[PDB]
Design a protein around this nucleic acid. Structure first.
Lengths: 49, 259, 45, 48
DNA sequence: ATGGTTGGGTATAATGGGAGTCGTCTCGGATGCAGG
DNA sequence: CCTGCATCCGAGAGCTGAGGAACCCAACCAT
């Protein structure tokens, strides 16, 4: 469940990068920002009750 | 409640503009500014004072310099024989056009500002700073170039939003340039991690940043970028223990030291 | 121009020192918070 | 895989998504050097 | 006299959001609506 | 006109101990 929340945040970021960026020169590594996913996993394993 | 929907309703209660109306309003504003400077030359007074009194008379009694002096100068402007009351008329029309242009273009501000959420400023603060940038753009726009108003206004709206974020997002204020340094450092570290498959070290971040950057400087920059924590952070499952309950006072002398 | 800030045994504790660990900045796998130079741990049995 | 809707160009890459904690043999986790257990939760089942 | 910090500007066109919360039990008053 | 009766909102719910996301250029005051 926490992984899904982080992945949804990552998808939102990728969508914003798609819309703001230029479609001519794009590769998956530039769009994907894994900071929210790591943040969600850390949040679950460190601060969940 | 929910002030966001309220503001959106007030915003949508004003119709959008077509190209004819927008170019007409921009031309009216430009001619109003020219008429203001011509009137200042004729009467010998400052352009700022005359602009302020003309704006006061346009906005009316609803918007609360004092009535005595503004009425004095407004009557002095009525003392002009001819071909100068015309300049006064174009000045007033240009100010009305400025107001209408800002009101009609308020929606672009919201559309731009909706992409800067989650960076330390609430949505309505972003909207208000975007409005300030929009007012700037109306001030500086030039319709002769046959450019749509949004094209020029977007730059100023973005500038206002970013300057506001860099100025008001942290409890401890950090200068703008060093905020940009922090953001650049974060981006560089993130790309280094993406390429490396693990968190980079300070040496690698320093190498990636470029000349004049070493591990100690990176460490200091990451040190100052720490945000303060709350003295009211709860500790434990029960709502009976806070963070500040564990922090002693070191300033006041103890009874032993006083004795 | 220096003063004592040493680590001492709290009241009611003590025992035999069985282990010590020193972690310094730059050691492999060491992630010290910024500003911290080194960490010393003592295990007392 | 990034695909163009009209052109049809394809660019494939393997992206590092981060780290996932691993459960030890006995069934616990090592988080920031501390041993931790995730406790199962009981809740109303979804349905009608 | 040097960095540290602050202000202004970038011109194709762009013009109404988003996370969420549903397993408390009572009581006393404030209040609007039903009746006569 | 009066009255009572659903309806809604807000404030309560024991003590102690332990727990932790643009960039550039140009000028201006501080020291």
């Amino acid at each position: 469940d926490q992984f899904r929340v982080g992945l949804a945040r990552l998808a939102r970021g990728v969508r914003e990068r798609m819309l703001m960026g230029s479609e001519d020169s794009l590769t998956p590594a530039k769009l994907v920002n894994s900071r929210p996913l790591e943040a969600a996993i850390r949040e679950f394993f460190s601060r969940s009750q | 409640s929910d002030p966001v929907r309220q503001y959106l309703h007030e915003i949508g209660q004003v119709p959008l503009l077509t190209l004819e109306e927008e170019v007409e309003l921009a031309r009216k504003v430009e001619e109003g500014m020219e008429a203001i400077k011509k009137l200042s030359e004729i009467t010998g007074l400052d352009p700022d004072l005359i602009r302020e009194v003309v704006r006061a008379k346009i906005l009316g009694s609803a918007r609360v310099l004092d009535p005595k002096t503004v009425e004095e100068i407004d009557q002095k402007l009525k003392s002009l024989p001819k071909e100068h009351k015309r300049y006064l008329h174009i000045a007033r029309e240009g100010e009305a056009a400025r107001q209408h242009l800002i009101e009609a273009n308020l929606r672009l501000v919201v559309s731009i500002a909706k992409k800067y959420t989650g960076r330390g400023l609430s949505f309505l603060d972003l909207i208000q700073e975007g409005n300030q940038g929009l007012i700037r753009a109306v001030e500086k726009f030039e319709y002769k170039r046959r450019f749509k108003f949004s094209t020029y206004a977007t730059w100023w709206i973005r500038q206002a939003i970013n300057r506001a974020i860099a100025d008001q997002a942290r409890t401890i204020r950090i200068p703008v340039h060093m905020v940009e340094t922090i953001n650049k450092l974060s981006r560089t570290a993130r790309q280094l991690q993406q390429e490396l498959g693990r968190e980079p070290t300070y040496e690698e971040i320093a190498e990636a940043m470029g000349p004049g950057w070493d591990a100690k400087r990176v460490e200091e920059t990451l040190k100052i970028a720490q945000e303060p924590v709350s003295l009211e952070t709860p500790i434990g499952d029960e709502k009976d223990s806070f963070y500040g309950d564990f922090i002693p006072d070191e300033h006041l002398p103890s009874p032993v030291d006083a004795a | 121009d220096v003063k004592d800030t040493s680590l001492r045994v709290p009241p009611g504790e003590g025992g035999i020192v069985v282990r010590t660990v020193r972690l310094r900045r730059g050691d492999p796998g060491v992630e010290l918070k910024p500003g911290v130079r080194e960490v010393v741990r003592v295990y007392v049995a | 895989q990034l695909i163009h809707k009209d052109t049809g160009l394809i660019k494939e890459d393997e992206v590092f998504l981060g780290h996932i904690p691993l459960m030890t043999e006995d069934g616990s986790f090592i988080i920031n050097g501390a041993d931790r257990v995730i406790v199962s939760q009981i809740h109303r089942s979804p349905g009608v």
